[PDB]
Amino acid sequence: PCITILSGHFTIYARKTKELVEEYCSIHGYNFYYEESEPLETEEHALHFRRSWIIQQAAEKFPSTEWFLWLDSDVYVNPKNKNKPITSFIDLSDPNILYHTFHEAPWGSYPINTGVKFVHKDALEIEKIVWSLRNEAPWNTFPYEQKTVYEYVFPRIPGRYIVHDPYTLNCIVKAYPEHVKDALFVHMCGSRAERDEHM
């Protein structure tokens, strides 16, 4: 399908991850949207929610998109696998599914990690609602958009989401060091100097 990968960051590591993702899209014919812009709302919760505003900007630019893929700015493409398409790691053929998300068990603090998040075009209005909840309790409490997707969105869409193993597509470096080599998306979740050094 038509994939648009989107990300944003307003930083060496973040430029390097950008490059790799930008390169990866170019290799496979994916659209690339990057929010280089400065956020109007700069509080901690609002910055986490900003991904749900960015997707709306991505969709305006690329309206022919079937699947939107959010990647954090601390997620990069594993050089080893840069020549492999996304479809070689995940089945996006089920027309009923709106979200593909990934767990972080047992090292992670929450049932899903939205650092890598697949959103079907038919869920764009849902992402609009997530953005709108950014200043509403309990959604404005940590972990923010990630809590809102898991606890507000998912209950309303039974059967329309899959929570996947993270080993290839949301491979947190510190948590899964034995999986990093074979991963597609590597997530430097868990420090700028540390990230630059890694990049």
- Which is nearer to Mn ion, 115 or 166 (by Cβ)? 115
Query: Is 165 annotated as belonging to a binding site?
Result: no
Binding mask 96-125 for Mn ion (x = CB under 5 A): -------------------x----------
The binder of Mn ion chosen from 8, 67, 72, 195 (CB under 5 A): 72
Q: Are 51 and 35 in contact (CB under 8 A)?
A: no
- The answer to the question of residue 166 lying near Mn ion (CB under 5 A) is no
d(CA 17, CA 20): 5
Of 3, 170, 5, 165, the residue nearest 74 (C-alpha): 170
Q: Report 41-60 residues binding Mn ion (CB under 5 A).
A: none
Q: What angle do CA 149, 142, 75 make, to 5 degrees?
A: 70
Q: What is the 3-state secondary structure (H, E, C) of 116-153?
A: EEEEEHHHHHHHHHHHHCCCCCCCCCCCCHHHHHHHHH
**Residue 8 binding Mn ion, by CB under 5 A:** no
Q: How far is the CB of 175 from Mn ion (least distance, A)?
A: 12
Is residue 74 within the footprint of Mn ion (CB under 5 A)? Answer: yes
Burial-class residue 125 by CB neighbours within 10 Å (0-12, 13-18, 19+). exposed
Nearer to Mn ion, 97 or 112 (CB): 112
Question: Which residue's Cβ has the minimum distance to Mn ion?
Answer: 72
Q: Report the nearest approach of Mn ion to the CB of residue 156 (Å).
A: 25
Closest alpha carbon to 154 in 164, 165, 162, 166: 162
Binding site for Mn ion (CB under 5 A): 72, 74, 115, 189
Binding-site positions for UDP read 8, 10, 72-73, 189-190, 195
